[PDB]
Amino acid sequence: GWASETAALSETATPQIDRITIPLHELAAMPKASQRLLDDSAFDIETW
């Protein structure tokens, strides 16, 4: 304001607030693997 000595001090502004929404989506992968391939593979297909 820069108030004067005697000026009937008036009220000043106040910040206006904004709200931002983060919808928090999901990301999914579903690989299909044959059960016999998992059993007779020399490589650990489950950890790969």
Partner: peptide
């Protein structure tokens, strides 16, 4: 990685 019958898969 599936169906061990197929070579490329």
């Amino acid at each position: 990685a599936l169906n061990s019958a197929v070579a490329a898969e």
